[PDB]
């Protein structure tokens, strides 16, 4: 009934407990912002997987947005996974300034492409989860880099409270 | 009830009136920015900044009023689908204009930095490109060109404060859905 929101709170509490609670050796940990569950195809990581990609290729992962503790303007993107014992663990980290292009898959309601140095194809579990997370990602970018946006491909600009006029004035291109 | 209906619609009409009023102010600010980047006399620049400061002040006041009226209208539509939709529509249009204002001040900040950099190459012809960027990015070290660098430096600080206000207002309105 209300499983989506309730599982988001469990994931949030567990992500914070496993990844954003113990200090390093030696700032305090980063500050969690948001996350989303994703499907990653290990054979087709950079483009839309063909329909006949076997299910063994599909891996359960998560994308996480966080901020450095002493600088709320330094945002990082993380890819995480659930270990066999249930612990969450971050495996890959980008700086938000690396995000250059964000594209919506016109044929798959859950798919999207993020471009840093490489292209990364992922899918959310549902169509609504792609809309909410990408809105959070772009909104956080405009706020972080003072009215700038990465290149946006095939999105409704009103999702980010933009129009064609304000997008052209703000895009990094 | 009839009177209950026009009461809520009077709230929506008032919000929509202040919304278009807010949009005009934002465009007047953008125009004052671009006129201030032209060659103007001292008295002409004082007149332009008088209107700009007034417009900025009106924008802050309308942001307070739109924030309160939109939140109040949303509470009136907690169990009425039609009231909820109209109030939500007002909330989305408000956020789009806040995004316009943020982007407009962002453009002006860049072009004001580029003007301050080119104005720093005159006061220090021997200074390198990196020393120019480092000097403009506050702080370390502060002719007609000297007063403008100090002026645009104090203006960049107030632009960053205004854009921080818009970020806070933007997030205050997102804690509504």
Residue numbers in the entry:
A (entry chain B): 75 to 99, 102 to 249
B (entry chain A): 33 to 174, 191 to 225
What's in the article?
Most syntaxin proteins contain an N-terminal region that autonomously folds into a three-helix bundle (the ‘Habc domain') that interacts intramolecularly with their SNARE motif to generate a ‘closed' conformation, which, in many cases, blocks its assembly into the SNARE complex345678910. Here we report that the exocyst subunit Sec3 directly interacts with Sso1/2, and promotes the initial assembly of the Sso-Sec9 t-SNARE complex and stimulates membrane fusion.
Consistent with previously reports of Sec3 lipid-binding domain2324, the core of Sec3N folds into a PH domain that contains a β-barrel formed by two sets of β-sheet with a helix capping one end. The seven main interface residues on Sec3 consist of K149, Q219, E222, H224, Y237, R241 and R245, which together describe a horseshoe-like shape on a relatively flat surface of the Sec3 PH domain. In the Sso2-Sec3 crystal structure, the N terminus of the H3 domain bends approximately 22° away from its original position, and is tilted towards the Ha domain. The four Sec3/Sso2 dimers in the two crystal forms are essentially identical.
